[PDB]
Amino acid sequence: CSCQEKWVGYRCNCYFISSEQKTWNESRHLCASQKSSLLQLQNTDELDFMSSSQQFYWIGLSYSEEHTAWLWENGSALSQYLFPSFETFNTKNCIAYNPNGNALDESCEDKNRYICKQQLI
Amino acid sequence: VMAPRTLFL
Amino acid sequence: MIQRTPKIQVYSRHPAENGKSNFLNCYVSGFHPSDIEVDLLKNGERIEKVEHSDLSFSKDWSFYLLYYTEFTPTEKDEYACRVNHVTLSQPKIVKWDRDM
Amino acid sequence: SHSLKYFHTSVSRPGRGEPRFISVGYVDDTQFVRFDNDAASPRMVPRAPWMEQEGSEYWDRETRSARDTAQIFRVNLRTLRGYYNQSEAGSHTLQWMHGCELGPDRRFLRGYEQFAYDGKDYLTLNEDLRSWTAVDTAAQISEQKSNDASEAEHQRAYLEDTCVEWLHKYLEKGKETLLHLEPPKTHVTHHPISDHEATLRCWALGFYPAEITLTWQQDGEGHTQDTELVETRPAGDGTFQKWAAVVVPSGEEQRYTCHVQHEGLPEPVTLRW
Amino acid sequence: ARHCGHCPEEWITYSNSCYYIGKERRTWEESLLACTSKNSSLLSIDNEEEMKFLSIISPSSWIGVFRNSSHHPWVTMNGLAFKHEIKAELNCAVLQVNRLKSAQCGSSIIYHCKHK
Numbered sequence A: 001c002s003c004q005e006k007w008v009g010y011r012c013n014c015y016f017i018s019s020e021q022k023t024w025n026e027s028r029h030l031c032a033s034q035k036s037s038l039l040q041l042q043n044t045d046e047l048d049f050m051s052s053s054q055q056f057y058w059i060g061l062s063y064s065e066e067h068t069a070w071l072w073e074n075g076s077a078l079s080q081y082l083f084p085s086f087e088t089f090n091t092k093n094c095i096a097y098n099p100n101g102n103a104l105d106e107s108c109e110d111k112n113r114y115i116c117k118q119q120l121i
Numbered sequence B: 001v002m003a004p005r006t007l008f009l
Numbered sequence C: 001m002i003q004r005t006p007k008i009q010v011y012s013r014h015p016a017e018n019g020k021s022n023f024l025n026c027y028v029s030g031f032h033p034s035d036i037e038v039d040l041l042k043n044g045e046r047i048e049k050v051e052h053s054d055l056s057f058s059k060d061w062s063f064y065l066l067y068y069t070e071f072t073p074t075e076k077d078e079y080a081c082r083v084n085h086v087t088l089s090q091p092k093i094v095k096w097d098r099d100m
Numbered sequence D: 001s002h003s004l005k006y007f008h009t010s011v012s013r014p015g016r017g018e019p020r021f022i023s024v025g026y027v028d029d030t031q032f033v034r035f036d037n038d039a040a041s042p043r044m045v046p047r048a049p050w051m052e053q054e055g056s057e058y059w060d061r062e063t064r065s066a067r068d069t070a071q072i073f074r075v076n077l078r079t080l081r082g083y084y085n086q087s088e089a090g091s092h093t094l095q096w097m098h099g100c101e102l103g104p105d106r107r108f109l110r111g112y113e114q115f116a117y118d119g120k121d122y123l124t125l126n127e128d129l130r131s132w133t134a135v136d137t138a139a140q141i142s143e144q145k146s147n148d149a150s151e152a153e154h155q156r157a158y159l160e161d162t163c164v165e166w167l168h169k170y171l172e173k174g175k176e177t178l179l180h181l182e183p184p185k186t187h188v189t190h191h192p193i194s195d196h197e198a199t200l201r202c203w204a205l206g207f208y209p210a211e212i213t214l215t216w217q218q219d220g221e222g223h224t225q226d227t228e229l230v231e232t233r234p235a236g237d238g239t240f241q242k243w244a245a246v247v248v249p250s251g252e253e254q255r256y257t258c259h260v261q262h263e264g265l266p267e268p269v270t271l272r273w
Numbered sequence E: 001a002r003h004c005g006h007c008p009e010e011w012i013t014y015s016n017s018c019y020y021i022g023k024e025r026r027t028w029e030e031s032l033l034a035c036t037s038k039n040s041s042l043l044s045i046d047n048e049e050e051m052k053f054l055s056i057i058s059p060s061s062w063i064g065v066f067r068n069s070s071h072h073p074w075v076t077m078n079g080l081a082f083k084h085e086i087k088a089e090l091n092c093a094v095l096q097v098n099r100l101k102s103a104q105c106g107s108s109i110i111y112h113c114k115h116k
Helices: A024-033 A044-050 D056-083 D140-148 D152-171 E028-036 E050-057
Strands: A008-010 A013-017 A061-064 A069-072 A113-117 C007-012 C022-031 C037-042 C063-071 C079-084 C092-095 D002-011 D020-027 D030-036 D093-102 D108-117 D120-125 D132-134 D187-192 D197-205 D212-218 D227-229 D240-249 D256-262 E018-020 E060-066 E092-096 E099-103
Touching: A024 A113, A044 E050, C007 C079, C007 C092, C022 C037, C022 C079, C037 C063, D002 D056, D002 D152, D020 D056, D020 D152, D030 D056, D056 D093, D093 D152, D108 D152, D120 D140, D132 D140, D152 E092, D197 D212, D197 D256, D212 D240, D240 D256, E028 E060, E050 E092, E060 E099
Parallel strands: none
Antiparallel strands: A008 A013, A013 A113, A061 A069, C007 C022, C022 C063, C037 C079, C079 C092, D002 D020, D002 D093, D020 D030, D093 D108, D108 D120, D120 D132, D187 D197, D197 D240, D212 D256, D227 D240, E060 E092, E092 E099
């Protein structure tokens, strides 16, 4: 297991925490061009080292109208006890995580800090 | 400048 | 849940001289629920271009706003401010006496 | 004395999404910068003409905080509503206020910081700026959430260092107006009530340090019976007004004399009418 | 449940060097001890670009930079003259939001450990 230079490495994952403020749309592509996905969460401990952090980060999660529900990048289920207000998020708007557990449903055309994610071989 | 950091209550 | 009651002061920015340019002020103070409304009235008619100060709170969390406009005082013209808020069971219209 | 007081207000709107978040920074008694997510500019803007020549570097870095502060406060306005087991369709207010003060020596004199949930003080940074104190008997959680994760240290930093430094950086930029002591234009106005009673009102006009103290005193020692006083009010251009009144026996008004205690004046002026 | 083989389990890898993230309130002395009880050193700052990173990870930390008395030059562990700007009875430095500050060595702060 090893990572890229400006990248941080936890449990054989390469994480890219953002310097800049960008669109939800834009950030996805920007992860893609650096061969990673927009942060899909496992659980609370998958960003433990970043506990303190006070910034808010874009995550790879949208609401499409196949399932009338929140699905990830891959299209997997949202753990209905990861985000407590999962039945509150405005569908028009996008989610934004913070390693204190909290989420913010927010205007997708808005500009936030963001995380990319890599993994195994 | 304002405080660079707040509290999570 | 505190509900503080707004203290209204209505005044002229400079000594009330007739004919010459002046500013009319309404300064509400010491109230806490933020959703307050203010209007300045020429002969009972609300003036449209009223400008307000950016919301700020004092030492005790009570709020204060300032409301001004260009005008011209006269002998036969009487100006007044009117504040509608969450504590007042009905709006409170306080008149501008040139000596206050 | 000089201060760099900031004022943050967040109001939760169930029918909208984002809560209304407003910021205002104060050098002594001038609001110079503000922030509002409701305007057609969700960035930090200048009010006082002496910030106009400040570049991007600064504004981006302050908007960075404002915006972020709103998001962190959004979450508290939800976290707090949990603690209080409050109805989700209620309007609520969370206010944050912090300030650093200089003194005679011109370096750090004292600091402070506190939070408040709907008009009731919620949290307060101690005089020693090292540990948070729970105000309301339901704040203990937010206390121990912050005491444990060393946040005081970061405020001890801003207050004793960052705030301090920028006060001095701002005062050098507004030197010619912020440090320009303005004396109050003082006169007495006569007003009758009946034949046996009348009101003498002592006027103060246009003074820039806001703190003032008007007094009514009779031919010497000076009583304060049937006196009246008002809230020091702002001009509208960045000065201050205040008047002091008293009920006086019609005919012999000279018996009562007025005194003005102000910082800008050399002499506490006497007024006669 | 596999982690990197060049560092311990709950550790993070940035630039050829592992880190330990604190979450514990301890004193400079102890902070140096605890790190050395883990085969590594106390957090040293290399570049003014590691520094931006290190604040987005965890914002307060003791750094391997101290004075002896109030008036001596600031020194690393190596005993080398420290080459970064660092701001009465305070003698150990801390990292706080992308600047280095002087702190009371008895203050109970968070420590991060660093490798090679």
